[PDB]
Design an enzyme around this catalytic site. Structure first.
Site, mmCIF file in Angstrom:
data_model
loop_
_atom_site.group_PDB
_atom_site.id
_atom_site.type_symbol
_atom_site.label_atom_id
_atom_site.label_comp_id
_atom_site.label_asym_id
_atom_site.label_seq_id
_atom_site.Cartn_x
_atom_site.Cartn_y
_atom_site.Cartn_z
ATOM 1 N N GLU A 65 -24.991 111.917 115.642
ATOM 2 C CA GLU A 65 -23.646 112.449 115.771
ATOM 3 C C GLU A 65 -23.659 113.595 116.770
ATOM 4 O OE1 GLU A 65 -20.550 111.849 115.869
ATOM 5 O OE2 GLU A 65 -20.229 111.448 113.723
ATOM 6 N N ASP A 93 -25.080 108.820 111.666
ATOM 7 C CA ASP A 93 -25.130 110.243 111.982
ATOM 8 C C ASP A 93 -26.532 110.785 112.194
ATOM 9 O OD1 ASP A 93 -22.275 110.791 111.754
ATOM 10 O OD2 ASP A 93 -22.575 110.313 109.632
ATOM 11 N N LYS A 119 -16.555 104.012 102.490
ATOM 12 C CA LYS A 119 -17.638 104.023 103.468
ATOM 13 C C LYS A 119 -18.643 102.899 103.236
ATOM 14 C CE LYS A 119 -17.796 107.935 106.446
ATOM 15 N NZ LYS A 119 -17.283 109.075 105.615
HETATM 16 O O1 LIG Z 1 -19.206 108.816 113.591
HETATM 17 C C1 LIG Z 1 -18.016 108.987 113.325
HETATM 18 N N1 LIG Z 1 -17.065 108.961 114.265
HETATM 19 C C2 LIG Z 1 -17.338 108.619 115.646
HETATM 20 C C3 LIG Z 1 -16.106 107.903 116.235
HETATM 21 C C4 LIG Z 1 -15.200 109.058 116.575
HETATM 22 C C5 LIG Z 1 -13.822 109.092 116.734
HETATM 23 C C6 LIG Z 1 -13.217 110.295 117.056
HETATM 24 C C7 LIG Z 1 -13.969 111.444 117.213
HETATM 25 C C8 LIG Z 1 -15.344 111.413 117.059
HETATM 26 C C9 LIG Z 1 -15.956 110.210 116.736
HETATM 27 C C10 LIG Z 1 -17.411 109.894 116.510
HETATM 28 C C11 LIG Z 1 -17.526 109.288 111.934
HETATM 29 N N2 LIG Z 1 -16.204 109.165 111.744
HETATM 30 C C12 LIG Z 1 -15.686 109.416 110.540
HETATM 31 C C13 LIG Z 1 -14.191 109.231 110.388
HETATM 32 C C14 LIG Z 1 -13.735 107.795 110.078
HETATM 33 C C15 LIG Z 1 -13.632 107.186 111.468
HETATM 34 C C16 LIG Z 1 -12.911 108.272 112.239
HETATM 35 N N3 LIG Z 1 -13.441 109.509 111.637
HETATM 36 C C17 LIG Z 1 -13.267 110.736 112.153
HETATM 37 O O2 LIG Z 1 -12.603 110.913 113.174
HETATM 38 C C18 LIG Z 1 -13.942 111.878 111.451
HETATM 39 C C19 LIG Z 1 -13.447 112.376 110.242
HETATM 40 CL CL1 LIG Z 1 -12.007 111.727 109.553
HETATM 41 C C20 LIG Z 1 -14.109 113.409 109.592
HETATM 42 N N4 LIG Z 1 -15.220 113.955 110.076
HETATM 43 C C21 LIG Z 1 -15.711 113.492 111.223
HETATM 44 C C22 LIG Z 1 -15.117 112.457 111.934
HETATM 45 CL CL2 LIG Z 1 -15.829 111.920 113.411
HETATM 46 N N5 LIG Z 1 -16.484 109.831 109.501
HETATM 47 C C23 LIG Z 1 -17.843 109.988 109.663
HETATM 48 O O3 LIG Z 1 -18.535 110.364 108.700
HETATM 49 C C24 LIG Z 1 -18.358 109.704 110.933
HETATM 50 O O4 LIG Z 1 -19.681 109.852 111.082
HETATM 51 MN MN LIG Z 2 -20.389 110.569 109.170
HETATM 52 MN MN LIG Z 3 -20.704 109.809 112.603
#
Ligand SMILES: O=C(NC1Cc2ccccc2C1)c1nc([C@@H]2CCCN2C(=O)c2c(Cl)cncc2Cl)[nH]c(=O)c1O
Ligand SMILES: [Mn+2]
Ligand SMILES: [Mn+2]
Length: 178
Positions: A65, A93, A119
């Site tokens: 990440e 991540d 998830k």
């Molecule tokens: O890898 C991930 N996203 C990539 C794809 C993405 C999109 C936008 C910005 C950065 C990233 C990088 C990833 N995404 C999520 C959730 C659900 C899918 C969208 N999302 C979020 O925008 C988010 C939430 Cl709601 C809370 N905290 C962090 C994040 Cl990035 N949850 C995770 O645990 C996780 O690892």
């Molecule tokens: Mn995550």
């Molecule tokens: Mn992630």
């Protein structure tokens, strides 16, 4: 433009986190100035990922990440072609060199149980570790990877973020955004 949430995010998280998060949102076509709650969420998730990787021994976790999408995939292919581990469908991540698993970190405002299942549907051999702003955690196979005190540090910080938000009346909006 110019919300309280955005100014709070910039004063609450450290600069490296804030700009890694901004870069990721823009990379995926989102604007931290408008979607300010998600901005807060990304920085929170980011900081948990970094604290998590500091929990193990010096060179046990690989951080995925925060990297730009192309580089994050490059390193997991390296990890896969070196561990004989299967290539995940979606970006995880971290990678745990000690236990030879990818890790999906979760940080939910909703209920811990419902978040893990949701998830889990995205799937299906990588470890899942969810933290809450309430202090609850759930991990695959009840294996929580790190020792109690490193996990306790993460939960302490999550609840501090909640309080600072609530002290500025931003918690209500943040909670009902997920
Ligand atoms: O890898 C991930 N996203 C990539 C794809 C993405 C999109 C936008 C910005 C950065 C990233 C990088 C990833 N995404 C999520 C959730 C659900 C899918 C969208 N999302 C979020 O925008 C988010 C939430 Cl709601 C809370 N905290 C962090 C994040 Cl990035 N949850 C995770 O645990 C996780 O690892
Ligand atoms: Mn995550
Ligand atoms: Mn992630």
């Amino acid at each position: 433009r110019g919300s309280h949430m955005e100014d709070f995010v910039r004063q609450c998280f450290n600069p490296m986190i804030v700009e890694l998060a901004e870069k990721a949102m823009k990379e995926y076509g989102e604007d931290p100035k408008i979607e300010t709650n998600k901005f807060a969420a990304i920085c929170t998730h980011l900081e948990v990922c970094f604290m998590y990787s500091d929990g193990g021994s010096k060179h046990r976790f690989e951080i995925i990440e925060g990297r730009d999408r192309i580089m994050a995939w490059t390193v997991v292919n390296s990890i896969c072609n070196t561990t004989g581990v299967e290539k995940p469908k979606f970006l995880p991540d971290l990678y745990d060199y000690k236990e030879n698993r990818f890790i999906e970190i979760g940080v939910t405002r909703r209920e811990v149980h419902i978040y893990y299942l949701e998830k889990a549907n995205k799937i299906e051999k990588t470890h899942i570790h969810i933290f809450s702003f309430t202090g609850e955690e759930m991990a695959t196979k009840a294996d929580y990877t790190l020792d109690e005190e490193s996990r306790a540090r993460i939960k302490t910080r999550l609840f501090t973020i909640r309080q600072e938000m609530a002290s500025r009346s931003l918690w209500d909006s943040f909670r009902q955004s997920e």
